[PDB]
Amino acid sequence: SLWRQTPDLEQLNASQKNSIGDLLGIRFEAFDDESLTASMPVDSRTHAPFGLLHGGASVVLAESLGSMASYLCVDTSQYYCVGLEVNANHLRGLRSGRVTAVARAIHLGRTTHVWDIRLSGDDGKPSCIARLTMAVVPL
Amino acid sequence: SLWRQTPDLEQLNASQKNSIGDLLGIRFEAFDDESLTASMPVDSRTHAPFGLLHGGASVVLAESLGSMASYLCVDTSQYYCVGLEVNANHLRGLRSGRVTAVARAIHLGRTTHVWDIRLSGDDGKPSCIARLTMAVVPL
């Protein structure tokens, strides 16, 4: 019940067609009343030159997830949402498998949303934490 | 003379082979004694679903640029560098053309580097600003 629009995973995934999220293999995986989850492969598409997951790729995942979450929480006939501020601590390096991100709301205001996004590799250890501020903008 | 290793643009670009930077069309473009510059296309590879440059893609560019800059500033037989913290304000949306990033050093310490990275679209207006903290790590 965080959501205004009920998350439809197929449509979330489909909507990424011809964008970076599709290019990187980001997949919306699960949701509940308080969270939305997506994962992303750790391979050549997402590696930095030394074969570790690129820190910016973590942020593509987090910002893709957070911005999508914001879209599910506004009146889309009245508003759209763009990223305003993003930050992240890179905690542990990942070489293979997938990285999984979970987004939860810190604050959903009238003009801004703040999302807490937690990332971990397939061993379940925290790999990155991000905070995303979205701007809520009238068309 | 910021640099330890003199920037070699061809080799910088070549080193991205089979990583996200190659996948996204990031290109190292110029450097001087105080800065390093890379650009990235704004198109389907880098777009978010609404056809604007994905904010995370800005951060892939900034973090690619900053981490490469860090590699040019350490003793690579003694150390490597990984992203530690990154943050960015998204200032203006971009739909097409390229986005160009310039990295300058804020602080190069023994265990951390802080880089200031300024992004703009082809109209020269600031599109994003990032600050990147790299950790300098002994192999």
DSSP chain A: ---SSPP-HHHHHHTTTTSHHHHHT-EEEEE-SSEEEEEEE-STTTB-TTSSBPHHHHHHHHHHHHHHHHHTTS-TTTEEEEEEEEEEEE-S---SSEEEEEEEEEEE-SSEEEEEEEEEETT--EEEEEEEEEEEEE-
Q: Is A85 a known active-site residue?
A: no
Q: Which residue from B16, B47, B59 is facing A56, i.e. has the nearest CB? A: B59
Task: Collect all residues of chain B within an 8 Å Cβ-Cβ radius of residue A86.
Answer: 55-56, 59, 87-88, 90
Structural domain boundaries enclosing B133: 1-139
CB distance from A60 to chain B under 8 Å?
yes
Interface A:B, Cβ pairs < 8 A: 125
- Per the structure, the count of domains in chain B is 1
Across the interface, do A47 and B18 touch by the CB < 8 Å criterion? yes
CATH code: domain of residue A20 = 3.10.129.10
Cβ–Cβ < 8 Å for A116, A89:
no
Which residues of B are less than 8 Å from A52 in CB distance? Answer: 82
C-alpha A121/C-alpha A2 separation (Å) is 26
Contact in structure between B38 and A35 (CB atoms under 8 Å): no
Quick one: which H or E segment has residue B4?
A: none
What resolution in angstroms does the PDB record give? Answer: 2.0
**Method used experimentally:** X-ray
